[PDB]
Amino acid sequence: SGFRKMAFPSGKVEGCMVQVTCGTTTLNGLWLDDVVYCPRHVICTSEDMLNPNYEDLLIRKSNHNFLVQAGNVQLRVIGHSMQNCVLKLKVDTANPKTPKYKFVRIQPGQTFSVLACYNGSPSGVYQCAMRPNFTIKGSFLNGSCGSVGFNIDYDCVSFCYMHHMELPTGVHAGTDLEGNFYGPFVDRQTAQAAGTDTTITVNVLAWLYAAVINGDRWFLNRFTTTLNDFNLVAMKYNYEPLTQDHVDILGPLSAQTGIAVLDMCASLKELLQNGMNGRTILGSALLEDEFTPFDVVRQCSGVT
């Protein structure tokens, strides 16, 4: 019992972190096999940041300008190439600590762990969600670029995020491991609109099921609703519209608790319309949306 915002164990990813320096800029890189991946803005200087011409900036760089260090180990760079917003630095040595891995592009509303790093050294690990507007609300300071987000399925690390930028609003933006930004963002020091965000409804429902499994049940009521009725409330409260695909992924939790998904929707409807009345659910005084239905099942069953 108990329910926590749990991150994946970070060891497999710690073994992949390196420091990359190009000129005056230092950030983090991810060393997998014989390639080091890092944000392409490592090649920028102060006057470059407003609208860098990355192709021209990279043309002035040679393999020997990319200093890659894995703590004590200096890596020899034998090739470089830019793919979207990432640089791929080919090195002459495969990382002996490369775990089984995949590169995946996650969907908005999915969760992942971030290993925050500075100068190639891990600082901490936390779990977060990719917002519906493709931003993440992380904890990143200058030097954290190149830190990655990931999920682990038994022995395989699926890398889904590389950190690139902090928007003027204090929220974070980055790319998949092929260097494609999540959302409309570009790697320029320019104010950039993040879309209207919404609350991840299916995750709030999954977390209400986690709450019932762990004994917090005060919010359960005598009511039910329909997808149509619930979605009128979701509209009012800026929640994602619930679909049958969301109801289907909540199937295991509904089966375990015996609480029909639409009955849980009626509890969520009452909580949206009335608030928590000074009470808490799993130690939170707000409706939590950073646990997916898979996260709830994994945590509630003890998956390793």
Add this chain to the structure above:
Amino acid sequence: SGFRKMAFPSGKVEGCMVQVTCGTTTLNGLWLDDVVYCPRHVICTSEDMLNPNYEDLLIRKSNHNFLVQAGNVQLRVIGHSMQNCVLKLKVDTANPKTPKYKFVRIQPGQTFSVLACYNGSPSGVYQCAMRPNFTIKGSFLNGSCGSVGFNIDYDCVSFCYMHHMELPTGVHAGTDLEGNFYGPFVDRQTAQAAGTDTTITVNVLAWLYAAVINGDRWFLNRFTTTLNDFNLVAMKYNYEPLTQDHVDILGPLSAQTGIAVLDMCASLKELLQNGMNGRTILGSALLEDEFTPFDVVRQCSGVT
């Protein structure tokens, strides 16, 4: 910018996790140098749990009854001994992945990371506080016993907690790495009173400083207070009385923000007396007490 409930990177601790089986029971052990540490209740069976005579139960066990496996590796047990509520199994091989480490007994109100494990395999990592009543509000299921809590200072892992028990209330109890329980708890399946808990005042103040550093400032007011006045409010709201030692540890945050500790106390006083009025601070709708002043400084400066 951004502020998250961040755990330490767990890699150094993942390398120490092993599975220990004695008879029918399997739990986790911590392999450091040539010793494996685990909860002594691994030697219990179902009818033993209400009041086990650990000395007698252990006398029926030999080195070869303790099956220790580090995934693929089977460890050869060459000695066993009980120290308080832990067993120390001497093995013939020093763990090649033993990090620099210390065993420390943490104080109530301090924080640490937990690497939840099942069958010697890491499942996830989360940050939590040792409550003032010596319980922890973790996320542990059957099989998680032997999972450890720790902090890391550069390359040194200070182990402070080993998980032993879930109280009937769903809160958790365990020991330091010498097997001494935190709090009044005993390793028996008996209902056991956990003391009256309180909110960790110095941590709430540290988190309000983290909030100001990250832009959440709506709670700052035109008021000040005294330690005496504040402690009357702390008494009413079940918060730990604030002392000059707490004010002193908040010195760096007060210096960084320019907000005198007693002025922050006046903001905390107003929040206790009036609530949050439907607003949030660092994404929380309640007053958070699981970040120490050191945690805030580390997160806000990018320590690795």
